[PDB]
């Protein structure tokens, strides 16, 4: 009989909600009332990276804070030198319908994936001098949405099949599958400790996973629409999600429910990319209104705006040293901000 | 100058990459991109076979025009989370089977298959991304539709239909319904073809529709529109 399983699930959900309410004693707004306001944070387009002839959909900095990879529907992955506008490589993708790209922490490999249901690993440091296809990871039944490298041999991939995956590149096999989501998973961010990662799906739910264990620890539900972007706090004990309902929310793993709601009345367009700053005080969100809004994390106040894109800001990332912010968008242009 | 020797050669490599990117983009611009959409069986397999994983990219050349046909029927996910990737296609090839007026779905039998195709046509014709993207509507299963309408009535799918049960009027009624579902008549056109099994006439219709979209877009960039 399904009836008492449904009843037990309802009872468990009520108990979890009661525990969360008991944990929620003071809102983050109350604690951050006496802190110094961030002020007006104004950034200028320090460098515009031209060359793409399609919509940029994803990007990822290297660990050196200088190299930068970008994917667009021209079938081309371009690795840019951000300090001096320069493309070190131009990888011709097998499938032009790319929706995510990654840069390995070591810098040796670059990941790519999209509507081909394949995570393609590209080797940069080759003796031949050209970027080749190291491994073509297949097994997802849905389009790729976010690929992130644990190391040179492991990658975590989120697909639209409501499942996230972990892979072993040398064998090219599915070492672990992260199931539990209801809708299509749209984004994922590896924690700095690399043992945990959170993934956001279309079911308005953010989920926390253990890479080693393979089971969901905590599930977060505060949004009313699909989460398109997600990013860890630099501390690793918190993360932020951006959804199509034009609001960003900050969650904490220890408390396992929301801390702050980042929304403005004039903001109606959804969020396509969220990246924290190095210190975590500045939450950067790219919206569909052709703008990227800098948010203070501790106070839900708009520190600034990063306007300058003619179309929707699709990808947005922050350097590991915090010295730059890059906001590639659908107008085929990549802009570095400082 | 103030650029080192290897920095200069890196700039030279970047310039060569510029040249290759421009060449590839110029090659891509001259080649037409088409998105194939269908409901259920639809007839996508037949229409693809006539003109010779999540994306099935079928490429063919017809009259000095390279055609890219993208099939997205195997996605089986939320269409709204990836349909914006196809904003910019020249035309959408939409196929509805005219033999599905008297056929219901396996699940939710109260819903008809032609009604499912109409709901899909409303979804993608009035979609925010496909505002200026024309639709090359394909009406296949011609012989089966004629044979079925020889005995079955059109009223099963169209309770508000008043006409005979022959071919021409029923086909015209279906076509009129499908084009009348287009809310944004001032920015896009719906090209309708009753799928033929003779020669390359269907591919010719796609070629002429693509030629219209090309000329209309050229008028748009020229600002004459």
């Amino acid at each position, epitope marked *: 009989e399904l009836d008492q399983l449904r009843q037990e699930a309802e009872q468990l959900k009520n108990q979890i909600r009661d525990a969360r309410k008991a944990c929620a004693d003071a809102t983050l707004s109350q604690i951050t009332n006496n802190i110094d306001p961030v002020g007006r944070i104004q950034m200028r387009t320090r460098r515009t990276l031209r060359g793409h002839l399609a919509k940029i959909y994803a990007m990822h900095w290297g660990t050196d804070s200088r190299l930068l990879v970008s994917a667009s529907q021209d079938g081309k992955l371009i690795i840019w030198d951000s300090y001096t506008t320069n493309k*070190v490589h131009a990888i011709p993708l097998r499938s032009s319908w790319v929706m995510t790209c990654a840069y390995a922490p070591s810098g040796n490999y670059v990941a790519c994936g999209g509507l081909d249901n394949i995570c393609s690993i590209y080797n940069l440091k080759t003796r031949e*001098g050209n970027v080749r296809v190291s491994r073509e990871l297949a097994g997802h039944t849905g389009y790729l949405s976010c690929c992130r490298f644990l190391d040179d041999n492991q990658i975590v991939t989120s697909s639209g099949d409501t499942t996230c995956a972990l892979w072993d590149i040398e064998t090219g096999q599915q070492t672990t599958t992260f199931t539990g989501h209801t809708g299509d998973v749209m984004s994922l961010s590896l924690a700095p400790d690399t043992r945990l990662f959170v993934s956001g799906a279309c079911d308005a739910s953010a989920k926390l996973w253990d890479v080693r264990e393979g089971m969901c620890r905590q599930t977060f539900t505060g949004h009313e629409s699909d989460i398109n972007a997600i990013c860890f706090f630099p501390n690793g004990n918190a993360f932020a999600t951006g959804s199509d309902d034009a609001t960003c929310r900050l969650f904490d793993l220890r408390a396992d429910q929301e801390l702050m709601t980042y929304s403005h009345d004039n903001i109606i367009c959804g969020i396509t990319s969220v990246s924290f700053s190095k210190s975590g005080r500045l939450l950067l969100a790219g919206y569909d209104d052709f703008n990227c809004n800098v948010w203070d994390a501790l106070k839900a106040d708009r520190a600034g705006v990063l306007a300058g894109h003619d179309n929707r800001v699709s990808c947005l990332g922050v350097t590991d040293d915090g010295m730059a912010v890059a906001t590639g968008s659908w107008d085929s242009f990549l802009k570095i901000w400082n | 100058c103030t650029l*080192s020797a290897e920095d200069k*050669a890196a700039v030279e490599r970047s310039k*060569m990459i510029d040249r290759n990117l421009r060449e590839d983009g110029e090659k891509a611009a001259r080649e037409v991109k088409l998105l194939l959409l269908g409901a259920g069986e639809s007839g996508k397999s037949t229409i693809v076979k006539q003109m010779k994983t999540g994306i099935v990219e079928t490429h063919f050349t017809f009259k000095d025009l390279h055609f890219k046909m993208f099939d997205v029927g195997a996605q089986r996910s939320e269409r709204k989370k990836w349909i914006h990737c196809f904003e910019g296609v020249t035309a959408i090839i939409f196929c509805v089977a005219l033999s599905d007026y008297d056929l219901v779905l396996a699940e939710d039998e109260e819903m008809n298959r032609m009604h499912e195709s109409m709901k899909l046509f409303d979804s993608i014709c009035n979609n925010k991304w496909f505002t200026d993207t024309s639709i090359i509507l394909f009406l296949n299963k011609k012989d089966l539709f004629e044979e079925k309408i020889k005995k079955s009535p059109l009223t099963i799918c169209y309770p508000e239909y008043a006409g005979s049960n022959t071919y021409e009027e029923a086909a015209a009624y279906i076509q009129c319904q499908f084009e009348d579902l287009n809310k944004r008549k001032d920015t896009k056109e719906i090209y309708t073809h009753f799928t033929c099994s003779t020669d390359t006439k269907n591919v010719q219709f796609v070629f002429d529709a693509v030629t219209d979209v090309i000329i209309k877009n050229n008028l748009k960039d020229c600002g004459l529109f």
Partner: single-chain antibody
Amino acid sequence: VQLVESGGGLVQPGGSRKLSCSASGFAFSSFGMHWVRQAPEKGLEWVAYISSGSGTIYYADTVKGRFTISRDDPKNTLFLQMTSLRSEDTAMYYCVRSIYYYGSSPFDFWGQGTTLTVSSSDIVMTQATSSVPVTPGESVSISCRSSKSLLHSNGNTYLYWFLQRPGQSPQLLIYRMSNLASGVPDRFSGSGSGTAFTLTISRLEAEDVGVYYCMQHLEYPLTFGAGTKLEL
């Protein structure tokens, strides 16, 4: 990867000869080519350079006008046309590949070389050590001094280290004074300040015996060193 070179041999003074460098195993079109001499008992001397796409061509002072360098990218071959040869050109010409981007490792591969025999303002780098007796397992600090500072405003110092085992083509060890080349063991490490540079071997092996060369890559009239030679 392989860079096999053809041509060479006896040539009468004032004659002409064509040196062909056959390339196989790597993307030749994207690699900038180089030519380096070595007299029968002297150091290395740079000759020419052709870039990717033949956009930029540089020769040496002793080479300009007489020699011309060209590449056939579809055929994956390199040419060094020679005119009005002289006795100073009696050297083994090496074919050198060099790709140029951020993080690249220029001068990765050196060809075996062809012996060409002719019958009868720039930076200067010195290695005063010359020969040195050595024992395995010890530490050696091969030093090289540049006339002018090799540190650029971009933070990249442009010193390179090369190893030439007896009867073998030169091999890249350290590029940009610090970066260990691919395949070189970790025993090699370089350091310097812009004027003086030292290359250190933590432990010596029997495979390390050879002649070490230091090269500059700041101004294109490339200058090598005399060559510190290690003897057991």
